[PDB]
Amino acid sequence: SRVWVALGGKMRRRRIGRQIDVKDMRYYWRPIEPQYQRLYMSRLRIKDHS
C-alpha cells in the first residue's frame, strides 16, 4: 500500500496581499496522482528486473 504523498496546495507568491495567513495553505500531504506513482516507481523496480 505504498502511497507517495506530496505537499498539497498552491504556491504563487503574490504582491503584498495575502491578508489571511490562517486559512493560508493548510500544510497537508496529499498523495500524488496514481499514474505518476507508477511512473517513478517504475524507475525503482529495474534494479532487479525479471
Partner: protein, 94 residues
C-alpha cells in the same frame, strides 16, 4: 454517526481539543497519523448512504464500457463461426 449536515472534510489541518491526559504529544501524534489517511483520530464515520457512490461507478463504468459497444453479441461480427471453428485473432493496431 448520522450526519444531517454538510458534514466536513477529514482532519487534514487539525485544531486539537484536549480534555485530560499525558496529552503532551497530541498535535505531534495528530499530524503523524493524519497523512496516512487514518484512524488514531477515530475517523468520524459519516454519510451513511455511500451506496449511491458505489452505484455511480456501477453506471459510470457500465455506460462507458458500453460506449465501445458492450456487446454480449459475440466476439463482434462473427459471421464466420456459426458454421464451426476456433477463432484465431486479429491484432489490433487500432
Amino acid at each position: 454517526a448520522a450526519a444531517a449536515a454538510a458534514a466536513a472534510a477529514a482532519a487534514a489541518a487539525a485544531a486539537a481539543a484536549a480534555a485530560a491526559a499525558a496529552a503532551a504529544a497530541a498535535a505531534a501524534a495528530a499530524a503523524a497519523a493524519a497523512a496516512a489517511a487514518a484512524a488514531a483520530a477515530a475517523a468520524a464515520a459519516a454519510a451513511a448512504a455511500a451506496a449511491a457512490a458505489a452505484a455511480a461507478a456501477a453506471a459510470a463504468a457500465a455506460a462507458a464500457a458500453a460506449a465501445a459497444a458492450a456487446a454480449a453479441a459475440a466476439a463482434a461480427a462473427a459471421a464466420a463461426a456459426a458454421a464451426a471453428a476456433a477463432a484465431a485473432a486479429a491484432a489490433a493496431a487500432a
